[PDB]
Design a protein around this nucleic acid. Structure first.
Ligand SMILES: [K+]
Ligand SMILES: [K+]
Ligand SMILES: [K+]
Ligand SMILES: [K+]
Ligand SMILES: [Mg+2]
Ligand SMILES: [Mg+2]
Ligand SMILES: [Mg+2]
Ligand SMILES: [Mg+2]
Ligand SMILES: [Mg+2]
Ligand SMILES: [Mg+2]
Ligand SMILES: [Mg+2]
Ligand SMILES: [Mg+2]
Ligand SMILES: [Mg+2]
Ligand SMILES: [Mg+2]
Ligand SMILES: [Mg+2]
Ligand SMILES: [Mg+2]
Ligand SMILES: [Mg+2]
Ligand SMILES: [Mg+2]
Ligand SMILES: [Mg+2]
Ligand SMILES: [Mg+2]
Ligand SMILES: [Mg+2]
Ligand SMILES: [Mg+2]
Ligand SMILES: [Mg+2]
Ligand SMILES: [Mg+2]
Ligand SMILES: [Mg+2]
Ligand SMILES: [Mg+2]
Ligand SMILES: [Mg+2]
Ligand SMILES: [Mg+2]
Ligand SMILES: [Mg+2]
Ligand SMILES: [Mg+2]
Ligand SMILES: [Mg+2]
Ligand SMILES: [Mg+2]
Ligand SMILES: [Mg+2]
Ligand SMILES: [Mg+2]
Ligand SMILES: [Mg+2]
Ligand SMILES: [Mg+2]
Ligand SMILES: [Mg+2]
Ligand SMILES: [Mg+2]
Ligand SMILES: [Mg+2]
Ligand SMILES: [Mg+2]
Ligand SMILES: [Mg+2]
Ligand SMILES: [Mg+2]
Ligand SMILES: [Mg+2]
Ligand SMILES: [Mg+2]
Ligand SMILES: [Mg+2]
Ligand SMILES: [Mg+2]
Ligand SMILES: [Mg+2]
Ligand SMILES: [Mg+2]
Ligand SMILES: [Mg+2]
Ligand SMILES: [Mg+2]
Ligand SMILES: [Zn+2]
Lengths: 24, 206, 60, 80
RNA sequence: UGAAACUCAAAGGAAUUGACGGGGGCCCGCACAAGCGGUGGAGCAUGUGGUUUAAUUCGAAGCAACGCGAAGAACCUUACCAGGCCUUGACAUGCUAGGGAACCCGGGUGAAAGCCUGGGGUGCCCCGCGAGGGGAGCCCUAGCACAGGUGCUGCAUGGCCGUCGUCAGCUCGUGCCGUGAGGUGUUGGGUUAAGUCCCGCAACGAGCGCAACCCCCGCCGUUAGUUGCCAGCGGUUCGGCCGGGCACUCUAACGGGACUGCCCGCGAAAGCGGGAGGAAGGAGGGGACGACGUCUGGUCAGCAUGGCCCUUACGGCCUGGGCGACACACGUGCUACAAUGCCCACUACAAAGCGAUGCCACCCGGCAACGGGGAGCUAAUCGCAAAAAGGUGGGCCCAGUUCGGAUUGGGGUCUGCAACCCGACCCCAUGAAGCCGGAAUCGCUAGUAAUCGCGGAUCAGCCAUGCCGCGGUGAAUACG
């Protein structure tokens, strides 16, 4: 969930981007 | 502790600001720090003139300004020898080169800031508080005004137990956002400590 | 405000980091609003006096 | 998950005091206030006394510890 | 029948204003009940107690202290601690003196601070042919007048705040009653959210409060179009793109609008119950606003302030620690325990905000953090920008498991002089507890609760899961 750093919703919550949530 | 400053509360209507100068997120803090430096000196000296207000307008290095006093002369000087030194004291403070008008306070007993200053002085000279208050309310109430009130803090009369003297007449509706009430606060150092003096004058409604 | 730690005006921090806002009016160092250079306390004091132009009491 | 980037940091107090001290060879003791500085190769063999805020702890530097900061060998607090 | 020694400053009566009652009668409030979701359980974040420490700076202490002062502790901040160095001082206003201009740049030494120590240099005023002499400013000493002190008193205080509270209520003037405190007014019937209004009354009025006057949201209209439209038409790179137009939507100034006015019913009236128009009724919904006063409440560490105390140190400068300690206990929260769910795709629909030593389109490199490079924006023009929940599709099949992401190993990117103590962020490993929480206990009456994400202040960065705001979806229940 929101606490999973390396996941979709995880990056959102932590307000970041990366492999699991790229900037499109 | 309750009740907001009746001026900060009435800025919307019945009560304009004391600095009508616009600015942007880069200079505002400066033009502000400046006004204070101004009021800092103006009050540090013109005390004797009895300065009720001090507006400050701007447009660009042409800092309007003004100073509403009860006794203009004290400002001016022999022909204008004081209003000279000071006028240069402003541009020496801030190389802005600005005006320095002077409005006269028609009645110094309808300007809360003075009425406060008034009583505040008496307190230091050791006048009986209750009297001063009773009187002050009168001066204000006699020379017009639909209402008025005065408040002194504590250690009244050098007492160890801080109290709070009252006194007030007519109307003074603070909850009514339209009263147009002048508020004036005057400190009051003393051998034993500070005493705060607030003054409220209700003049005209709508 | 310990009029000695009001050496913030120093401008010679050796390293720009050590630079810290600090109130211009109270010396209050813990709630200094960039925009006013004042602390939250004085920012509230002057605003009441109408000495901060434009600054009104918001409500909605 | 350590990090610093490209440009390993080391205060030049002891540096020009060590690489320079390597001219004659080695020496007994040193005294630094730079927990900040990284331990580099040219220190192995030295005995750098590090300050922990109250003391100057004698830290013998070895190969296996090249890379760690000096502070890591001068523990700050005192528990039981 | 009825003393005394000794001892007290009272013991008592009636009445008054209060407070109180496990006295009575009316009546309110998420007070209970009715509900819906939570917290004391787990892991973690944060504040606190307690321990510990050279120091773990200080305050806050039932409600109303405990994500509180702190809307940003690596150094700074920080007031704490350890060391090295200053000591008319970091900052004010003056002084006689011993005496040398101000200023610019150096090198030893050192952790820095500081200390030695050596040099380019030497204008200005009246004198003097000059030599050189006496002074303003200035700086440097040496000795004064003093500065400084987040050192103690918030029970010596301003100011400001919290609290009982938006709870109604607290009073006055004159008159009347009572020897008097003090009553009457303000009690009483009806009514209201309200000491709101009505009726009645030895009382008639008034002040601070209630309400109203201010702000936001809801409907309509003027005035205004580098935002909107193809509604209308004609050009199309089929992009409101271009022409062109203010209609619409907005943007934002000013107005209109609701008054129990209208209708039926009850009533002495105020007003209550419905009904019609109307976007909106009978305080439309939400704010700002919190009386006389109480807590002898908070705060001298925001400031101001009396007294007290230290004035080569209770002042000052640094470097490094500390505020981040950890057997343990509590508060507030975060993320969860899963299928009304978790993934990966792919697709939608926001509102308020912020943006020069900045938002950062777009392009290239990198799994990525981020780095190169650069378009446009002083922003209704550009940017942060994706909103998320949803919707379509597909995977997982019920397992400590595609639930959950705590720990820990490794490799990196950034901000910064600098991330050991003690920063976020990325990637690979690791994959803890937890299967819905004892006794207790918290919030909320509707766009509220629950749930979803977005922006701001502070700020280099950040330990924001805090805080202040914004909009999407949108319940249950209230006998009493
Ligand atoms: K009795
Ligand atoms: K309203
Ligand atoms: K008190
Ligand atoms: K959830
Ligand atoms: Mg998962
Ligand atoms: Mg101070
Ligand atoms: Mg800082
Ligand atoms: Mg600031
Ligand atoms: Mg006797
Ligand atoms: Mg009696
Ligand atoms: Mg009684
Ligand atoms: Mg009773
Ligand atoms: Mg209610
Ligand atoms: Mg309610
Ligand atoms: Mg209940
Ligand atoms: Mg728990
Ligand atoms: Mg312990
Ligand atoms: Mg204290
Ligand atoms: Mg503490
Ligand atoms: Mg809170
Ligand atoms: Mg520190
Ligand atoms: Mg107090
Ligand atoms: Mg106080
Ligand atoms: Mg206290
Ligand atoms: Mg009310
Ligand atoms: Mg009477
Ligand atoms: Mg009588
Ligand atoms: Mg009575
Ligand atoms: Mg009376
Ligand atoms: Mg009464
Ligand atoms: Mg009475
Ligand atoms: Mg009565
Ligand atoms: Mg009533
Ligand atoms: Mg009334
Ligand atoms: Mg009556
Ligand atoms: Mg319209
Ligand atoms: Mg009101
Ligand atoms: Mg208390
Ligand atoms: Mg107290
Ligand atoms: Mg702390
Ligand atoms: Mg908890
Ligand atoms: Mg790539
Ligand atoms: Mg298990
Ligand atoms: Mg798993
Ligand atoms: Mg660190
Ligand atoms: Mg299971
Ligand atoms: Mg925010
Ligand atoms: Mg930030
Ligand atoms: Mg941390
Ligand atoms: Mg955060
Ligand atoms: Zn201040």
């Amino acid at each position: 969930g929101k606490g999973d750093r390396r996941t979709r919703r995880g990056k959102i919550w932590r307000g970041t981007y990366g492999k699991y949530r790229p900037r499109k | 502790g309750n009740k907001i400053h009746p001026i900060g509360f009435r800025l919307g209507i019945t009560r304009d600001w004391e600095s009508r100068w616009y600015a942007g997120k880069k200079q505002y803090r400066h033009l502000l720090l400046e006004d204070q430096r101004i009021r800092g000196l103006l009050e540090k000296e013109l005390y004797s003139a009895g300065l009720a207000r001090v507006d400050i307008e701007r447009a660009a290095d042409n800092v309007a300004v003004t100073v509403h006093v009860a006794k203009p002369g004290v400002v001016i000087g022999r022909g204008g020898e004081r209003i000279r030194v000071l006028r240069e004291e402003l541009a020496k403070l801030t190389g802005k080169n600005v005006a320095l008008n002077v409005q006269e306070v028609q009645n110094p007993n309808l300007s809360a800031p003075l009425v406060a200053q008034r009583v505040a002085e008496q307190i230091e000279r050791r006048f009986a508080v209750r009297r001063a208050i009773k009187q002050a309310v009168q001066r204000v109430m006699e020379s017009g005004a639909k209402g008025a009130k005065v408040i002194v803090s504590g250690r009244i009369g050098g007492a160890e137990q801080a109290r709070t003297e009252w006194a007030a007449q007519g109307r003074v509706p603070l909850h009514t956002l339209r009263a147009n009430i002048d508020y004036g606060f005057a400190l009051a150092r003393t051998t034993y400590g500070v005493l705060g003096v607030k003054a409220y004058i209700f003049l005209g409604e709508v | 405000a310990r009029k000695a730690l009001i050496e913030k005006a120093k401008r010679t921090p050796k390293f720009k980091v050590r630079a810290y806002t600090r109130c211009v009016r109270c010396g209050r160092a813990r709630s200094v609003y960039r925009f006013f250079g004042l602390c939250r306390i004085c920012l509230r004091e002057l605003a009441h006096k109408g000495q901060l132009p434009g600054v009104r009491k918001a409500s909605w | 998950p350590r990090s610093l980037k490209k440009g390993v940091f080391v205060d030049d107090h002891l540096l020009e005091k060590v690489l320079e001290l390597n001219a004659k060879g080695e020496k007994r003791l040193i005294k630094t206030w730079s927990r900040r500085s990284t331990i580099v190769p040219e220190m192995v063999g030295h005995t750098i006394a590090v300050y922990n805020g109250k003391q100057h702890v004698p830290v013998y530097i070895t190969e296996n510890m090249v890379g760690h900061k000096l502070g890591e060998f001068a523990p700050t607090r005192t528990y039981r």
